[PDB]
Symmetry: D2
Subunit: 114 residues, 4 copies
Amino acid sequence: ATQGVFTLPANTRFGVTAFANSSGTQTVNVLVNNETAATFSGQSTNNAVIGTQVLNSGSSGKVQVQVSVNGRPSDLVSAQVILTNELNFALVGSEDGTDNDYNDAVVVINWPLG
Amino acid sequence: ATQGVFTLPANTRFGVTAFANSSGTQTVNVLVNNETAATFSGQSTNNAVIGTQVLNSGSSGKVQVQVSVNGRPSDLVSAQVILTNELNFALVGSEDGTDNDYNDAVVVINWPLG
Amino acid sequence: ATQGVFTLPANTRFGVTAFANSSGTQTVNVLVNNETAATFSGQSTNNAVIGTQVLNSGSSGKVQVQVSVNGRPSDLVSAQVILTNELNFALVGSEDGTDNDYNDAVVVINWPL
Amino acid sequence: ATQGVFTLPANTRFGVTAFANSSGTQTVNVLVNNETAATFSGQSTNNAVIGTQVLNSGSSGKVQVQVSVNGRPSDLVSAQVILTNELNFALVGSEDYNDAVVVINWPLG
């Protein structure tokens, strides 16, 4: 099944933050309505934030997270959780090899913002 | 925080199912747009599916789950989880005592159907 | 990524219930510690329960759900959620066609019972 | 029900990150094994990361998040989710429920 794709409410601000836990440099690309809205990169084996930014979902509200290493498209796992019917978390984990460490790159999308 | 309240897409059919795991008789009420749309009840300490029904979210899309035992409101816990940006689970757990057991009455709402 | 596999706490009773929303009969197998422990078969286009059973996680706690329709395995999506650090849900959705909602066979697992 | 308390595997490193989205200064305290292990304080209405650290869950594995705003304890909402049976997230919201948001993730690199 497709992973890393989320439908957010239209024209809404959301935060995107990426963490790295791999020996390899992680590249996180965020597409909003099929257009690159943010691109983060970094190397860390201690969960360092390699990028954090505030974006807007636009008309379609279609947000897609892609993760790659040296061009190598990483396999993703994802899900959305909503608490008390108002607080949203779109979560993504990625694997750059065969290590079931879908933690090589972790991406957290949250909304609404202040 | 409020628990057991979920906003579903408008005019959408959804399934609602209740489970019981308590010595006491459980009563589950499902409200759509603040009006009782379904009621289930039963007494089982073996996860019996005490009731199930297909409802329509209506114009508001507001669905609320209430659980009571002997007329007393149980302590509810809930969350919504979306898989592959399409499969929705609105989950409710409840405690009717003080044993830290939130499976006394469980309610699962899922959509889309068909 | 691997889907439909969950590690449950050992010596724990858990419920497993399957719902169907497909024109074809759904086959759901639940393997506990590499041995089939429950098998459901049914058809519904109204989210009806096609099977429900309370199982024991045993000594290891490995639980795997397999879904097939007319002999062909269905693609799965899954996740585990824990509420108030006590109530556990293991969720599985399955797709037997080209739709993207994975509701043909839906499985809900809850514990500790 | 109790919220903001999570049982992680013992002696396991995890990340804890806090975001602020409120007019008031958020005070986020992280208790590991019931002892203060980290504290973040900041104001933002633009999801600023007011804190992010890696901590060890210790012998007990108990992690509790506390949020207050100038002496007023915030009501919390929380849940834990596990993806592909290996990637864990512990989530917390607070109301002074996006005033202070905390995300915990494990296991690390």
